[PDB]
Amino acid sequence: QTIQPGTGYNNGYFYSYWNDGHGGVTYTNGPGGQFSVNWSNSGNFVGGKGWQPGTKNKVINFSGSYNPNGNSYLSVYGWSRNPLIEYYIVENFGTYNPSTGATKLGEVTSDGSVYDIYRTQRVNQPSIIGTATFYQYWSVRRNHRSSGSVNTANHFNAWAQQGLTLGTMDYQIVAVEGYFSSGSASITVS
């Protein structure tokens, strides 16, 4: 169904949908691992389906279409605790490469492309445990796509080799994020 922001389970998958209250986004849960997002002159939002908790060796499959017009990402997205880390495995994006200005910490080859690895810091920003300062880890795919398989262990192991360690996993979703943009997406996770 079409829903207001929140979290829960839908057809055996965890979902999360958040927005900043600006307007312009419609999130719909579909059957099984499916969700759709349609947005028009949105604010900031994130929505998707996956698992709570995630794991460090999940192979995540996703299939569908992703058509941003402006600033948006399509990623495997999640958190760890202790240490608190927000992470992204970015499969596709719109007008903005989210690694712009950020410190490159290596490369990893996985699932048919090279990914560039980055770390950034968020200072006194909202998090799963309240306002905090924490790092963000990124793998950014060079060859953009809207279907595929992501072997998360390849990323998490590469990160660890470079000194980017993860704690206890919290949620782990395939997410569409937007920042004051428009677009449509329909994705099925498994």
Curated annotation (Swiss-Prot):
- Species name: Hypocrea jecorina (strain ATCC 56765 / BCRC 32924 / NRRL 11460 / Rut C-30)
Where found in the cell?
Answer: Secreted
Q: How does activity depend on pH?
A: Optimum pH is 4.5-5.5. Stable from pH 3.0 to 8.5 at room temperature and from pH 4.0 to 7.5 at 40 degrees Celsius.
Q: Which SUPFAM superfamilies match?
A: Concanavalin A-like lectins/glucanases
Specify where it is mainly localized.
secreted
- Does the keyword Secreted belong to this entry? yes
Question: Which Pfam families does the protein's record reference?
Answer: Glyco_hydro_11
- Annotated active site residues, numbered on this chain, are 86, 177
Q: Which residues are glycosylated?
A: 38, 61
**Family stated for the protein in its record:** Belongs to the glycosyl hydrolase 11 (cellulase G) family.
Reactions this protein catalyses: Endohydrolysis of (1->4)-beta-D-xylosidic linkages in xylans
At the top level of its lineage, which domain of life is listed? Eukaryota
Gene name in the database record: xyn2
Please tell me whether the keyword Signal is annotated for this protein.
Answer: yes
Its protein name is Endo-1,4-beta-xylanase 2
EC code: 3.2.1.8
Which positions carry Pyrrolidone carboxylic acid? 1
Q: What positions does the entry give for substrate binding?
A: 73, 77, 88, 122, 126, 136, 171
